[PDB]
Design an enzyme around this catalytic site. Sequence first.
Site, mmCIF file in Angstrom:
data_model
loop_
_atom_site.group_PDB
_atom_site.id
_atom_site.type_symbol
_atom_site.label_atom_id
_atom_site.label_comp_id
_atom_site.label_asym_id
_atom_site.label_seq_id
_atom_site.Cartn_x
_atom_site.Cartn_y
_atom_site.Cartn_z
ATOM 1 N N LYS C 79 0.870 -1.175 0.000
ATOM 2 C CA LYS C 79 0.000 0.000 0.000
ATOM 3 C C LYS C 79 0.905 1.222 0.000
ATOM 4 O O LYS C 79 1.873 1.277 0.757
ATOM 5 C CB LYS C 79 -0.893 0.016 1.248
ATOM 6 C CG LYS C 79 -1.918 1.129 1.241
ATOM 7 C CD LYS C 79 -2.922 0.982 2.373
ATOM 8 C CE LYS C 79 -4.011 2.048 2.267
ATOM 9 N NZ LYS C 79 -5.149 1.799 3.186
ATOM 10 N N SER C 154 -9.620 2.042 2.471
ATOM 11 C CA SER C 154 -8.681 2.733 1.617
ATOM 12 C C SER C 154 -7.680 1.829 0.881
ATOM 13 O O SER C 154 -7.025 2.252 -0.079
ATOM 14 C CB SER C 154 -7.948 3.810 2.429
ATOM 15 O OG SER C 154 -7.448 3.283 3.635
ATOM 16 N N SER C 178 -10.089 -0.103 6.654
ATOM 17 C CA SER C 178 -9.344 -0.033 5.397
ATOM 18 C C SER C 178 -8.640 -1.298 4.910
ATOM 19 O O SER C 178 -8.083 -1.315 3.809
ATOM 20 C CB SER C 178 -8.334 1.117 5.442
ATOM 21 O OG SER C 178 -8.986 2.371 5.434
#
Lengths: 398, 99, 485
Positions: C79, C154, C178
């Site tokens: 990420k 996210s 997330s």
Amino acid sequence: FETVIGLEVHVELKTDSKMFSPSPAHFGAEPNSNTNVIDLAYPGVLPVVNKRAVDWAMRAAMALNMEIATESKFDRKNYFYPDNPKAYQISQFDQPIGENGYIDIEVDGETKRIGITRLHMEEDAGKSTHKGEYSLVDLNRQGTPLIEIVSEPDIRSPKEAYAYLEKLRSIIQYTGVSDVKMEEGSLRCDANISLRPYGQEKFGTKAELKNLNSFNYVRKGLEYEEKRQEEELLNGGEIGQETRRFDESTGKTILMRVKEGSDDYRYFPEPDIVPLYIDDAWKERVRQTIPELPDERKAKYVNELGLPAYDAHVLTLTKEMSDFFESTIEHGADVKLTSNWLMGGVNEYLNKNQVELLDTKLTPENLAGMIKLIEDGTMSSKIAKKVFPELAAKGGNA
Amino acid sequence: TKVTREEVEHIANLARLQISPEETEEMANTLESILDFAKQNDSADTEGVEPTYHVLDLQNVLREDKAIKGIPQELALKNAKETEDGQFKVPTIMNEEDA
Amino acid sequence: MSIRYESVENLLTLIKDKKIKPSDVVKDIYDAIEETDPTIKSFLALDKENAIKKAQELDELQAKDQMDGKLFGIPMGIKDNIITNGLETTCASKMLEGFVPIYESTVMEKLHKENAVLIGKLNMDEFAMGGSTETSYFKKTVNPFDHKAVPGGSSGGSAAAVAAGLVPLSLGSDTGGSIRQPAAYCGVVGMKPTYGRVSRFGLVAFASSLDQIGPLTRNVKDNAIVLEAISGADVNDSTSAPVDDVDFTSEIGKDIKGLKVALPKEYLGEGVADDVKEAVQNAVETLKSLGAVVEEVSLPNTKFGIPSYYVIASSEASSNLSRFDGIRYGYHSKEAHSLEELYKMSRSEGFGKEVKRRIFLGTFALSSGYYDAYYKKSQKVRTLIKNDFDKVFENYDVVVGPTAPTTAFNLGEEIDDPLTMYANDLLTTPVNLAGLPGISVPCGQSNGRPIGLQFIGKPFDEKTLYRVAYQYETQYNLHDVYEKL
Ligand SMILES: [Mg+2]
């Protein structure tokens, strides 16, 4: 019409590394060479609490007669400014490591016990050199462990303020946690002053005095401000909350801004640092790590080794000086002799030669002799004129 | 309910975010709706409940005071868009219009 | 693109038996990417050259019979809010486009130490704020199971890259869901370990008290393995827990008969769609068919999860995002002539709409006069949410329910509707608030879109989570579906 004033004092702890970062606390002349991702506030960095800084913060707070907290966490003081990269200074709001203490001072008249409301740990900001229409920013000093000391609003005159800074400086100096020199920035001070005419509770204007760089200098601004709002109160005056800069050259304070309210710092507990739980044992270790401070060291020079008033104050002005004096004492230097020799003579030699390193020059071993050679050996004083200087910046005996 | 232009611009200021009176109005409403959304917590009974500042119950995690030399100036400035003489360069004209 | 669908475990052994060369494993990965990401758009910066090099080093080690590391020669996506020394890390924001970290985050440190192979960085919502990854400044990642749908937020890129067969494992960060919500939307296995289980040193902060890194994989087993490579204490993160037992695979494969499972009634409440609810109830039955004992319980303060979470998260964000002034790095406004402009212009031009919304809310929630009524209040509510779990855990081993109230929604469906977007965190936020570990595994499909089953555990009991998750997975999973998309 008491002029009520309080003092906000910061002290630089002299640790190896910074408060929340391993970067060294002492830097060279090359800018931004004493940093790391932490001090630079890079995304995703975390604060790591300097253990000694805590031990010293709670060592200096005890020496200040404060109640040491058992639970103490850190908080963020949020504000945007080039020398404060994270945009928040890690400090303490509730639970400051030290609260409600005091120090005794002697001002014209007699003794007055001034309260010290709190002592908390913080990190210093970087330096911002104003060049041209721009600004240069060096983060070398950012993150340096400071401690904030706020007096209760007890001091009552620009002179009491001086006496305060002197005793405070004196006591902090003895704990060996800071050189507390204002010419070196290891001790800073801001003053807050306001006047309230008697019989009533309401105050006139209140001002925060900034840019006070010397004990002597705070008094100047303090007593100038005092007269400044003394007129305002009487003549017409418009009550207000303000910040003022002290002009070193002119001796006046200049209005740099008028508060619209109370500066919102959005204080809140620092989740990145687990709370501190200061136990008895811990408090003991640091309790015991404290010498005899100036006041009780001076009270020791009064009835035992019954020396004067003036004498007691100046010989206890610094730990080194006071140690030197007592080391030289048993050695064989008559009580008074050395006292008078340190009081003036050596004290004046230090100031005139700026030889403040009373330690890597003349020693109690060396000085001890001179006083005997005068005491009886050879006869009296005038010879002492130059024997002293040489003996001070040079050799080891007469 | 009742979130004025004034508060919207006072917050923007506390946050150093530039906003246009063509964004303020829009923001007044947004906040308002968000706050109304936030107001939901008021239906929760917290009388006598201590605030949770930390979820993990650790204690005294301290670092020994041993310095570690910092990175080179070069590394420290490498990502900054504006620099001069080994430092970060920034405007500083103090006029209460700009600041 | 041949082993692009092999599990970490099998790929691991396929490499140890020298049946495949690390350099070719990577050749397959980038092949997969080149062919699939154009549609999936889950990758941001790619680190092909470095990856190539590392693998060449791994071939030698393979030949010399010195293959060390729990994840030797294993491909990995990270990420983009997790710092990677030398690799462009953007948090999917204009504010950090072009930003090259000058230090290494702790999990990457740990991951390199295990000889994994950094393939690249994954897309995400800007600064981890969003539930669909649609706020990215760079691109909109899409759901492999349905290209008209969002991957979740996210960590959408992390869930999408795994479900799309681009990498066998990826890292995400979970602040209020997330990691788990995108996993639920993409039908994969994602875990948010206990707060303190994985260092946050090198994690671009969203909400310090809520944030946490965790892995996403295609099966429960590969996930536990990855967690073992990133768990552990770190002198760089003061909040990292001093817990040595970082073994999560030991109890996997063991039965769950007698396991006491709590099914919060609030987790099957009014905000949960009819299909998600039916799948979870069939999952409850599955768990019963496995011996586990499942009984209803109540976590009364659940309803307060989203609001107390937004107030707390936004608040902390209004402080963690303040370092972004474009002075020492990041976006630096050119039209600024004053210092005030520099902060205000850089920040307003560099941050997207949602990020500024949070900051606004957060800054307001902490301001004078509102602090006690918003922020402090939320923190007290946080205590209530954790007490709920403390109580349930007095008699239950784990807690189960849906990961998200609905299947993944459509791209553009809630992008302009932040309030409804927020409602999707109903079932995830209580976990971060309580600091518990929570895991999501697929448990169904409604119109092709996967549904998530979540297991919330006691602090540092991830192993029990993997045990029950694995059991359930033997009864249901989408292992054979990824291959078909
Ligand atoms: Mg301070």
